[PDB]
Design a protein around this ligand. Structure first.
Ligand SMILES: CCCCCCCCCCCCCCCCCC(=O)OC[C@H](COP(=O)([O-])OCC(O)COP(=O)([O-])OC[C@@H](COC(=O)CCCCCCCCCCCCCCCCC)OC(=O)CCCCCCCCCCCCCCCCC)OC(=O)CCCCCCCCCCCCCCCCC
Ligand SMILES: CCCCCCCCCCCCCCCCCC(=O)OC[C@H](COP(=O)(O)OCCN)OC(=O)CCCCCCCCCCCCCCCCC
Ligand code: SF4
Ligand code: SF4
Ligand SMILES: [Zn+2]
Lengths: 114, 112, 206, 178, 125, 231, 96, 94
């Protein structure tokens, strides 16, 4: 029922904060692959940003959105200021692990993965 | 008559009892605004009254401090300023009102 | 007796009187004052009285609770407001200590007190990093104890002890990669709690 | 009771005598030659060094070093598989698995310790009600692989057979304090 | 200053827990049964939430018990089924619930062991 | 846990005899050396009120003229039965804190002389075998003692619920433990209060108007160990 | 202790102190390894009568917090304790 | 005593041997298998039976401490001996 808000009154203002955050990220992205000698392309980086944004699309609560904005800002700080490293940024792509196949059979054959 | 407060960043106050009277009186002058049923007023008023009694009854600091039970008169003065600011912030807050919102009945229960 | 701890009632008296004092000055922002067997004074309050109460205790002439000994949080996941918040405060003019508690949850932040005590600048960051609790009007609020890309609040009661990821060096990419957690000896969960009641004084009713 | 450090009892004198003394201290570098003298004195003393492999540092009969599984004079083992060591070991380093032996006795089939998990706290030999597991005196058991530090019943029993002539004496020494 | 948001509550995107361990799971809410070895009942008083168990295999080197599920030793304690279920929903776990199996009241009569007509008469005192 | 072996107090006395001459050996080199005084004096100055509001404790308090020692105030052990002085400073600088730590090393010998001379006899752990284990002979001859040993080393002693904040005047300041208890063999929460935490927090203000080579001394004046900090 | 008078005097003059009485290397002044065996005392609760745990339990003498001003269930102004009494300069050595 | 298996591996005091078809025998290649050659199950059998003129006897293992908890054993069953569950010793009633 009724609640006490955080940094927003409605999902519209929340979404415009989100869009400001996306502006910031999208713009900064290439400076990272430049500063730290990442192998990936800016296209890959931007697709990854889009993926990590749409991962939290079903969200509806202005508060649950403001907190995600806060955390994304923390990450962007850690990134533009070179506190993270090649390792922490490449920990997004999972270059050294195969995923659980999204196939009942590919699961059954090897393990009890349900 | 004193070279050092014994502490750091506390300059000796060559003009004591005067800033004391001033600050205590300007505290009273804002406690007046507070309603009578306010415990903050009810209490701090008599606090300042006893302290004013002490300062106006003893001019010597070596015997005024031992009766105020505080530390050095500069620290008493710092506390008086803090109290004045606390009153100015109280008057804008509203502690003398009733409670805002009671909590669930299982909140301050220990153990659970 | 030689094996039991002494018991002085003067402190209980002083602290109950000061509890009444504080509570009748702030009938608002106050609830559940209590002084315990071991002579320690707790005051529970509403999240809207943090700065009021801290300022009162620090500046008020009778209180002079200047030092912020500690700031802490505590996770009890069986109550709607699960994150207890605790300020342990010290006064030297009286040689006294006090505890001020409030409550919070996820999505329901608390007000920062760096204006009152500047020590909190790091304690509040630690609380945010460990229990996941936001603070309003904090200049910098960011991971302090955890790694830079860590996703989680590990001092909760639902976050697993060993975590969700694990690090190792891989020659292919020449970096310290993260991966799921695969242990060679699963931590053993010893069920110790006894079936027989040990303290009747705390016996809950059915 | 308190004291003062870096506070003078009262102002000093600007007398020519004291001013010249301080000027001598400054120009002639007086307070430093005393440190030079301390270093020279230390040069002219005996160093506390010792030939390590030939001269060893002193220890006590309570030293907590390498582990050992003991026996009785008969030669029978002592561990009865009661698992108090496994239950008190803070680092969860002891793994035990027991069974009834063909002679009908409570004895282990598996007793493993991980020296890369042991914090060397002694709680296991504090708990053992039979004096079967003991943190012996040895400390010189480094290795080159991480797989030689995962001990087992056999390694620990061999260490017991090895060091019993010393463990027994140290226990005879100290058992009246515990 | 208050807003109204009546939609269901979810913090799944803040917990940091991943999809594999937030959707592929099954949680159980119950009261731990009394150990028939003992007659104490100070353990059947708080509800507990645990998870489904997963593979627990043998290390080739030493024979230890190895796993990959980091929520195998995760047990949570509650004072009320409503709070347990609210927490489960909040976090996003599919949960099964069991009821508190309370014992029945029993009629005991030390005199029944000595009756003149009944079968409750006992043959050894 | 155990009592003292029969040849320990004599050794401690032989050691206390000469530690003073050792401190003096060091003081000759360091305290009056103009280079030490230039590296330390007027460095990392901090006033008493700002120290308080920043949450400092110990030498960082009583090097600015404050009188706070949790052994003369809020005593916990028999410290109330022994005499020692508390050295306070006047300017709040690295030199004052150095001198404070030295005089503390001296008051420690003053306390050790008394502790040795006044060592009493008797047991060493509370004879409440539901908290502290029994001796091994009693364990191996008596039933109750063996049961208590078993329970203590498998499912240890149970602690009535509550909460505390016990502060110790550790060498680096107030060491605290907010310990929460449920009626269980294990705690529900243990929060450790370390001084290095607030000291590092205040490093930035203490390093105002200073070079790169004075920060390495500002740090040393706090005794920054990162185990108590990072925990 | 294995040094000549000339070196002893040299080091003592260079240091300002006397070292041959407060050395830091140990020469037979120390306790003897292989001490005799002890016989430890026994606590006060080692009686055989009048030793019931009901009297000396302790951890059951605890009681829940004494609650005050629960929100659901012309005094003077006091302090949490009498103000702290200031300390006295030492007598042995109050300066340095 | 250690008696070897077809594969050439020594058996332990708990009958452990890597099956000849087992790949885990690799770790022993160019190396050894640490095994204890003193089997308690035999060393205790080598001991003789104690005799007592009392139908109940207390065992501790030797020293009061340094042994094991004092346990009391019954010797009414002349058919067999009375064994200690701690030390393995066995007694008779004469
Ligand atoms: C592999 C070699 C390669 C070839 C390189 C060329 C060779 C160069 C020669 C150097 C030889 C050094 C080798 C020394 C070990 C030889 C074996 C031996 O003598 O056993 C030690 C044995 C000592 O046994 P100890 O039980 O340890 O007793 C030591 C004293 O108590 C403690 O002694 P102390 O500290 O009390 O002093 C005793 C005395 C010892 O004599 C010297 O040190 C003279 C040093 C030369 C003066 C320049 O010195 C003095 O104090 C009096 C003279 C003052 C000299 C003034 C110096 C400035 C102040 O005998 C010696 O000490 C004699 C060695 C003297 C060094 C001779 C070199 C000149
Ligand atoms: C005919 C009558 C009139 C004739 C005219 C001549 C009359 C005599 C004039 C007097 C001459 C005085 C000596 C000249 C050098 C003096 C230099 C000096 O004084 O340096 C000052 C400086 C410290 O200055 P300051 O920081 O202000 O002092 C602290 C304030 N409380 O001090 C320093 O910082 C020095 C730093 C020294 C650090 C290294 C010290 C190593 C010492 C090793 C021993 C060296 C001995 C000499 C070796 C000779 C080489 C063969
Ligand atoms: S000494 Fe090592 S093995 Fe023994 S209880 Fe302590 S940590 Fe565990
Ligand atoms: S405590 Fe001693 S007897 Fe019990 S399992 Fe451990 S080693 Fe064996
Ligand atoms: Zn036996």
């Amino acid at each position: 029922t009724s609640v006490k808000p955080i940094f927003s009154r409605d999902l519209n203002e929340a979404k415009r904060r989100v869009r400001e955050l996306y502006r910031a990220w999208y713009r900064e992205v290439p400076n990272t692959v430049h500063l730290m000698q990442l192998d990936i392309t800016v296209k890959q980086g931007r697709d990854k940003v889009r993926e990590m944004f749409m991962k939290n699309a079903h969200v509806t609560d202005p508060r649950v959105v403001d907190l995600l904005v806060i955390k994304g800002k923390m990450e962007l700080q850690e990134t533009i200021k070179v506190w993270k490293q090649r390792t922490h940024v490449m920990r997004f792509f999972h270059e050294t692990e195969t995923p659980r196949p999204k196939d009942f059979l590919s699961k059954f054959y090897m393990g009890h993965d349900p | 008559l004193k070279k050092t407060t014994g502490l750091v960043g506390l300059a000796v106050c060559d003009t004591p009892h005067e800033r004391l009277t001033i600050l205590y009186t300007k505290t009273l002058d804002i406690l007046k605004h507070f309603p009578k049923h306010a415990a903050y007023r009810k209490y701090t008023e008599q606090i300042t009254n006893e302290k004013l009694d002490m300062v106006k009854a003893e001019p010597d600091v070596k015997k005024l401090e031992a009766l105020l039970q505080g530390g050095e008169v500069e620290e008493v003065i710092l506390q008086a300023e803090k109290e004045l600011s606390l009153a100015r912030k109280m008057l804008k807050w509203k502690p003398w009102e009733p409670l805002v919102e009671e909590p669930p009945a299982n909140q301050w229960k220990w153990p659970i | 007796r030689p094996t039991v701890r002494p018991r002085s009632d003067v402190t209980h008296k002083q602290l109950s009187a000061f509890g009444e004092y504080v509570a009748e000055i702030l009938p608002k922002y106050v609830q559940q004052v209590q002084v315990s067997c071991l002579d320690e004074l707790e005051i529970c309050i509403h999240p809207d009285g943090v700065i009021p109460t801290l300022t009162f205790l620090r500046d008020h002439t009778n209180a002079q609770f200047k030092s912020l000994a500690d700031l802490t949080a505590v996770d009890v996941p069986t109550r709607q407001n699960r994150f207890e918040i605790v300020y342990n405060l010290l006064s030297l003019r009286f040689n006294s200590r006090i505890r001020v508690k409030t409550y919070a949850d996820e999505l329901t932040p608390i007000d920062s007190i760096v204006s009152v005590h500047i020590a909190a600048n790091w304690y509040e960051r630690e609380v945010w990093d460990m229990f996941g609790v936001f603070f309003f009007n904090h200049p910098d609020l960011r991971r302090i104890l955890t790694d830079y890309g860590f996703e989680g609040h590990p001092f909760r009661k639902d976050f697993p002890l060993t975590g969700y990821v694990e690090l190792r060096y891989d020659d292919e990419v020449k970096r310290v990669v993260a991966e799921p957690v695969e242990l060679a000896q699963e931590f053993r969960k010893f069920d110790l709690n006894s079936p027989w009641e040990a303290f009747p004084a705390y016996r809950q009713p059915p | 009771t308190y004291k003062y450090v870096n506070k003078k009892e009262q102002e000093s004198e600007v007398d020519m005598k004291s001013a010249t003394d301080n000027a001598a201290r400054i120009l002639m570098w007086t307070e430093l030659i005393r440190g030079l003298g301390m270093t020279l004195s230390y040069l002219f003393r005996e160093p506390a060094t010792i030939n390590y492999p030939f001269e060893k540092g002193p220890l006590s009969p309570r030293f907590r070093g390498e582990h050992a599984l003991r026996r009785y004079p008969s030669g029978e083992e002592r561990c009865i598989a009661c698992k108090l060591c496994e239950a008190i070991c803070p680092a969860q380093a002891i793994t035990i698995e027991a069974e009834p032996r063909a002679d009908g006795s409570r004895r282990t089939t598996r007793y493993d310790i991980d020296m890369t998990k042991c914090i060397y706290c002694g709680f296991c030999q504090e708990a053992c009600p039979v004096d079967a597991i003991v943190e012996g005196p040895n400390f010189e058991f480094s290795t080159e692989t991480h797989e030689e530090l995962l001990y087992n019943k056999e390694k620990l029993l061999n260490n017991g057979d090895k060091w019993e002539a010393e463990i027994a004496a140290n226990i005879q020494a100290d058992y009246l304090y515990r | 200053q208050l807003i109204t948001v009546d939609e269901k509550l979810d913090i799944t995107t803040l917990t940091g827990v991943p999809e594999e361990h937030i959707k592929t799971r099954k949680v159980r809410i119950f009261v731990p049964a009394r150990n028939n070895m003992q007659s104490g009942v100070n353990n059947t008083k708080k509800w507990k939430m645990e998870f489904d168990t997963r593979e627990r295999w043998e290390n080739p080197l030493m024979g230890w018990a190895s796993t990959a599920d980091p929520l195998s030793n995760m047990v949570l304690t509650f004072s009320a089924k409503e709070d347990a279920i609210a927490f489960a929903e909040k976090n996003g776990w599919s949960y099964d619930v069991e009821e508190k199996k309370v014992p029945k009241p029993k009629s005991k009569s030390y005199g029944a062991n000595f009756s003149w007509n009944k079968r409750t008469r006992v043959s050894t005192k | 846990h155990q009592d003292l072996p029969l040849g320990l107090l004599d050794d401690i006395y032989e050691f206390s005899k000469n530690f003073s001459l050792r401190i003096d050996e060091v003081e000759e080199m360091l305290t009056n050396n103009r280079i030490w005084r230039n590296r330390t004096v007027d460095i990392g100055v901090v006033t008493a009120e700002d120290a308080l509001n920043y949450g400092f404790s110990g030498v960082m308090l009583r090097g600015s003229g404050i009188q706070w020692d949790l052994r003369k105030t809020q005593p916990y052990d028999v410290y109330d039965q022994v005499e020692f002085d508390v050295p306070i400073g006047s300017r709040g600088d690295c030199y004052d804190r150095y001198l404070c730590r030295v005089e503390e090393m001296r008051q420690s010998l003053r306390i050790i002389e008394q502790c040795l001379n006044k060592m009493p006899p008797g047991e060493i752990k509370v004879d409440d075998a539901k908290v502290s284990p029994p001796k091994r002979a009693e364990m191996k001859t008596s039933m109750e003692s063996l049961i208590h040993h078993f329970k203590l080393y498998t499912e240890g002693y149970q602690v009535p619920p509550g909460a505390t904040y016990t502060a110790i005047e550790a060498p680096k300041g107030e060491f605290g433990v907010y310990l929460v208890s449920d009626g269980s063999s294990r705690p529900y929460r243990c929060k450790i209060k370390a001084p290095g935490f607030a000291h590092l927090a205040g490093l930035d203000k203490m390093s105002k108007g200073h070079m790169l080579a004075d920060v390495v001394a500002i740090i040393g004046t706090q005794d920054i160990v990162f185990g108590e900090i990072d925990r | 202790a294995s040094a000549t008078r000339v070196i002893q005097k040299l080091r003592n003059w260079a240091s300002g102190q006397d070292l041959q009485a407060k050395l830091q290397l140990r020469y037979q002044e120390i306790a003897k390894r292989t001490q005799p065996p002890p016989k430890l005392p026994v606590g006060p609760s080692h009686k055989l009568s009048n030793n019931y745990y009901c009297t000396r339990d302790g951890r059951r003498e605890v009681v829940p917090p004494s609650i005050i001003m629960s929100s659901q269930k012309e005094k003077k102004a006091v302090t949490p304790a009498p103000p702290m009494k200031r300390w006295e300069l030492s007598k042995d050595q109050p300066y340095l | 005593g250690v008696q070897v298996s077809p594969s050439g591996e020594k058996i332990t005091h708990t009958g452990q041997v890597y099956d000849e078809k087992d790949y885990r025998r690799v770790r022993f290649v160019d190396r050894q298998k640490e095994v204890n050659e003193n089997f308690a199950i035999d060393l205790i059998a080598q001991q003789p039976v104690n005799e007592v003129e009392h139908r109940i006897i207390a065992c501790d293992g030797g020293g009061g401490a340094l042994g094991h908890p004092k346990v009391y054993i019954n010797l009414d069953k002349e058919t067999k001996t009375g064994t200690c569950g701690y030390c393995g010793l066995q007694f008779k009633q004469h």
